[PDB]
């Protein structure tokens, strides 16, 4: 699982 | 029609005069030129050295007309390029406009709000300058009334819009001090009847939530999520778009903040969002769903219970590639965090073939994402002894020939990912 | 990064 | 650890 | 033109299409000189004149050794040109004609046939397989089938070895296995010959056959060629070291067992000179090989240590060009990845830290990941030893902390996550 | 390396 910002990068 | 006007030379002659009337006529002719449709001679007006003069007129409290005309002219200059907006700032316009916010003439006050809105909207730099001149206290004071419906419609809209620009832009983001000071007023405007006020308010909140989880907490702590979800189900697109962005931003936060969106009933309206005629809304809504399926199992279960999985499968099947990529992500997070029983349900919703069809894509990232999902699903199959069943499904969707083709191809993750799948789950005889 | 834009408004 | 071919990829 | 030499293509076709053998020979001679021109020989003009099939027919005339020779020379030069020009020779059916000429009692003609086949086979996998399909190998090996190779002329032996190496060259597809097993035994012999050019060509052939899957590597290795390859590795002739190093480099991409056979042959004793070779491409190849060796067992890493190679790797990492530095970085990562704690402590003692940190400034995302992985591995060994603080200070004294701090604002994901992980753990308050 | 024209011995 991986949350991502609107650019599809990542949050973490 | 749509024409007329003076020469920039004549206006200059008129403003340099000592006759107040002559200065007013010139300032009017200025406003006519800078307001004309179109190609206004902004740079020529600046070259004449008229900005400082306009700014000095803003202080002419003994003549409301020239204050108004000057405020208008400067607004249109400030509405242009950064270089043009900067000329207005270097002319000392900011503190002069802020002084005008408290004018007994509402229309002059409104114009100053507008002007400050264009300046702050240029970027975080000029935004911070506006805040550092203490523009916030006067602005909020204008909204410090019992009932907002007393204010004029255009007035309230401009104020809401200007505030939203004080919340806009990053690197740096607005000061926490300013955000904390503005938020209480923003909450009020979120519950106003006017669509444009609601739009600008949602935009303002989408800005403030577009950052670290600490900034998201400031917003959510005021209890705005329920209202945001209400505006999510609006029929007018200018409201839904920023509302969805705000919700989308909040969901990138923690599992706790995500839960508040779910509790607010956001999942109930997402079917219309995932099937929205506006492709940009589908991408945005699919992206949000993917960050929800990255949460806890209990959160994944609420996605199942609200029946969103078939809609997610739908996006994956019949959406533009950009939206499909987001869907693919949502399913990987789902299969990654989901329980075995949640993955079985996923397979029952017909995920495989749409998933395999994207395996022919030209994008490398989406392929990695899909192979991961396939692996996660196979892992759940092994705990059921349904490995053979799943393997059959995949070749019944033409998916095997697609995995076979990925035995070649560039990139290293696709090598071992594909190679591991056939060895564990297929192999034997097929062609050589 | 990511669109939908409306930062500067001119009065006509 | 990882053995690589001359092109610097990875031993297939 | 006129009754003179240095003919026109028009005069050559006239002489060749004549019914007079004397005039056919003169024309072919004129054609051979022309194709032996120093600069821009008119190959396309000669092809476009349709002379190839006439040349190939002459190859069949055992009644006239001279025209057989001249034609074989002509075709060899045409076959030397572009793939299109080589193809024109093949389409003219030249291959089976050359093969028939290998058994000629005229050695100088047999040699020229070997040469021709070499050019054709050298064009690529397709034409190489054509030559093999026409059954060229048996006749070729039959020429080398002698008790003592020194009886053959040096020009004759060098051609055979070279042509044979081209039958081993190229991939997609590689040479057929049965053909390789047929050639290898002869290849072993030529590897033990005394001529440096023969040795060079032999080494190239081995480097080709080993450039592939582990199965093809085992074919070569179980012939016991590794010890000789290592001997050729320590030669002074660069033309021998290069292919020998390539062969060794290929073998090491295989299994740990095969790698051990390289180490047991004493290859690690010559790598100090290879890693400090004046030619930069030798250092790269040698550092690449070392990276694959340090991807092996801990006992194999220990032999890299025992032969004193670590300070040389640290050396390459410090002063070599970036290309070679990349390979060196990989060698360190594999080392720290598979090594024991004690082996990693030794690595730090050899001063690996500062040279590693300095490469974090490089404009290459991949090497940055590699180094970050190496540093992380070292810290893990420092954890077990309970000396992460000592390692932290070292990094600070080597100017490393500032660079890891900069990689936090890096575009790549693996770079910024790895950096963050290191600061929080070891460089917090 | 791949081929050679003959005089000689070269590459074409």
UniProtKB/Swiss-Prot annotation, chains A, C, D, F:
Reproduce the UniProt comment on modification after translation.
Phosphorylated on several residues by host. These phosphorylations regulate VPR activity for the nuclear import of the HIV-1 pre-integration complex.
Q: Where Phosphoserine occurs along the chain?
A: 10, 12
Q: Where is the signal peptide?
A: none
Q: Where in the cell is it found?
A: Virion; Host nucleus; Host extracellular space
Provide the coiled-coil residue spans. Answer: none
| Quaternary assembly | Homooligomer, may form homodimer. Interacts with p6-gag region of the Pr55 Gag precursor protein through a (Leu-X-X)4 motif near the C-terminus of the P6gag protein. Interacts with host UNG. May interact with host RAD23A/HHR23A. Interacts with host VPRBP/DCAF1, leading to hijack the CUL4A-RBX1-DDB1-DCAF1/VPRBP complex, mediating ubiquitination of host proteins such as TERT and ZGPAT and arrest of the cell cycle in G2 phase.
Record-stated family: Belongs to the HIV-1 VPR protein family.
Misc remark for this entry? HIV-1 lineages are divided in three main groups, M (for Major), O (for Outlier), and N (for New, or Non-M, Non-O). The vast majority of strains found worldwide belong to the group M. Group O seems to be endemic to and largely confined to Cameroon and neighboring countries in West Central Africa, where these viruses represent a small minority of HIV-1 strains. The group N is represented by a limited number of isolates from Cameroonian persons. The group M is further subdivided in 9 clades or subtypes (A to D, F to H, J and K).
**Reported function:** During virus replication, may deplete host UNG protein, and incude G2-M cell cycle arrest. Acts by targeting specific host proteins for degradation by the 26S proteasome, through association with the cellular CUL4A-DDB1 E3 ligase complex by direct interaction with host VPRPB/DCAF-1. Cell cycle arrest reportedly occurs within hours of infection and is not blocked by antiviral agents, suggesting that it is initiated by the VPR carried into the virion. Additionally, VPR induces apoptosis in a cell cycle dependent manner suggesting that these two effects are mechanistically linked. During virus entry, plays a role in the transport of the viral pre-integration (PIC) complex to the host nucleus. This function is crucial for viral infection of non-dividing macrophages. May act directly at the nuclear pore complex, by binding nucleoporins phenylalanine-glycine (FG)-repeat regions.
Indicate what this protein is called per its UniProt record. Protein Vpr
According to the entry, what is the taxonomic lineage of the organism?
Viruses, Riboviria, Pararnavirae, Artverviricota, Revtraviricetes
User: What is the name of the gene encoding this protein?
Assistant: vpr
From Swiss-Prot, chain B:
Q: Give the UniProt tissue specificity note.
A: Slightly detected in brain but not in cerebellum and skeletal muscle, highly expressed in testis and spleen.
Where is the protein found, in the record's own terms? Cytoplasm; Nucleus
- Record note on modification: Ubiquitinated. Deubiquitinated by USP22; leading to stabilization and increased activity.
Keywords, A to Z, come to:
Acetylation, Cytoplasm, Nucleus, Phosphoprotein, Protein transport, Repeat, Transport, Ubl conjugation
UniProt region (NLS binding site (major)), positions on chain: 72-168
Q: Could you tell me one molecular function GO term of this UniProt entry?
A: nuclear import signal receptor activity
What portion of the full-length protein is represented by this chain? 71 to 502 of 529
Gene field: Kpna2
Q: Which GO terms describe its cellular component?
A: cytoplasmic stress granule; cytosol; glutamatergic synapse; host cell; NLS-dependent protein nuclear import complex; nucleoplasm; postsynaptic density
**What residue spans do the ARM repeats cover?**
1-41, 42-81, 82-123, 130-174, 176-212, 213-252, 255-294, 297-339, 340-386, 387-426
In residue numbers, the region (NLS binding site (minor)) covers 245-333
What is the similarity comment for this entry?
Belongs to the importin alpha family.
Name of the protein described by the UniProt record: Importin subunit alpha-1
- Report the domain remarks: Consists of an N-terminal hydrophilic region, a hydrophobic central region composed of 10 repeats, and a short hydrophilic C-terminus. The N-terminal hydrophilic region contains the importin beta binding domain (IBB domain), which is sufficient for binding importin beta and essential for nuclear protein import. The IBB domain is thought to act as an intrasteric autoregulatory sequence by interacting with the internal autoinhibitory NLS. Binding of KPNB1 probably overlaps the internal NLS and contributes to a high affinity for cytoplasmic NLS-containing cargo substrates. After dissociation of the importin/substrate complex in the nucleus the internal autohibitory NLS contributes to a low affinity for nuclear NLS-containing proteins.
In the UniProt record, does the keyword Transmembrane occur? Answer: no
Q: How does it assemble?
A: Heterodimer; with KPNB1. Component of a complex containing CSE1L, RAN and KPNA2. Interacts directly with CSE1L. Interacts with PLAG1. Interacts with APEX1 (via N-terminus). Interacts with FRG1 (via N-terminus). Interacts with ARL4A, CTNNBL1 and NBN. Interacts with ANP32E. Interacts with SNAI1 (via zinc fingers). Interacts with SNAI2 (via zinc fingers). Interacts with BAG6. Interacts with AIFM2; this interaction likely mediates the translocation of AIFM2 into the nucleus upon oxidative stress. Interacts with RSL1D1.
Q: What does this protein do?
A: Functions in nuclear protein import as an adapter protein for nuclear receptor KPNB1. Binds specifically and directly to substrates containing either a simple or bipartite NLS motif. Docking of the importin/substrate complex to the nuclear pore complex (NPC) is mediated by KPNB1 through binding to nucleoporin FxFG repeats and the complex is subsequently translocated through the pore by an energy requiring, Ran-dependent mechanism.
Work out whether the entry's keyword set contains Nucleus: yes
């Amino acid at each position: 699982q991986q949350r991502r910002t609107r650019n599809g990068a990542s949050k973490s | 029609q749509g024409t007329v006007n003076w020469s920039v030379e004549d206006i200059v002659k008129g403003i340099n005069s000592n006759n107040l009337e002559s200065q007013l006529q010139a300032t009017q002719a200025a406003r006519k030129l800078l307001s004309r449709e179109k190609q206004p001679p902004i740079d020529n007006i600046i070259r004449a050295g008229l900005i400082p003069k306009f700014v000095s007129f803003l202080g002419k409290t003994d003549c409301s007309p020239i204050q108004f005309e000057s405020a208008w002219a400067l607004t249109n200059i400030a509405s242009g390029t950064s270089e043009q907006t900067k000329a207005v700032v270097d002319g000392g316009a900011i503190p002069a406009f802020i002084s005008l916010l408290a004018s007994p003439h509402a229309h002059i006050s409104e114009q100053a709000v507008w002007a400050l809105g264009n300046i702050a909207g240029d970027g975080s730099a000029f935004r911070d300058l506006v805040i550092k001149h203490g523009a916030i206290d006067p602005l909020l004071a204008l909204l410090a009334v019992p009932d907002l419906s007393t204010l004029a419609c255009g007035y309230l809209r401009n104020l809401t819009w200007t505030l939203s620009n004080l919340c806009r832009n990053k690197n740096p983001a607005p000061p926490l001090d300013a955000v904390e000071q503005i938020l209480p007023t923003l909450v009020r405007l979120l519950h106003h009847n006017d669509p444009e006020v609601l739009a600008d308010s949602c935009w303002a909140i989408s800005y403030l939530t577009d950052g670290p989880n600490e900034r998201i907490e400031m917003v959510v702590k005021k209890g705005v999520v329920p209202q945001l979800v209400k505006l999510l189900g609006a029929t007018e697109l200018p409201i839904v778009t920023p509302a969805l962005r705000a919700i989308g931003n909040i969901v990138t936060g923690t599992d706790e903040q995500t839960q508040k969106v779910i509790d607010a009933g956001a999942l109930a309206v997402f079917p219309s969002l995932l099937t929205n005629p506006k492709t940009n809304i589908q991408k945005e809504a699919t992206w949000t769903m993917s960050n929800i399926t990255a949460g806890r199992q209990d959160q994944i279960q609420q996605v199942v219970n609200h029946g969103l999985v078939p809609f997610l499968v739908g996006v994956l099947s019949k959406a533009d590639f950009k939206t499909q990529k987001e869907a693919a992500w949502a399913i990987t997070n789902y299969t990654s965090g989901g329980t075995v029983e949640q993955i079985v349900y996923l397979v029952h919703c017909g995920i495989i073939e749409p998933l395999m069809n994207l395996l022919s894509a030209k994008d490398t990232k989406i392929i990695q994402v899909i192979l991961d999902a396939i692996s996660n699903i196979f892992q759940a199959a092994e705990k059921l002894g349904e490995t053979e069943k799943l393997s059959i499904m995949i070749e019944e969707c033409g998916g095997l020939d697609k995995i076979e083709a990925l035995q070649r191809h560039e990139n290293e993750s696709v090598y071992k990912a594909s190679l591991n799948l056939i060895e564990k789950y297929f192999s034997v005889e097929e062609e050589e």
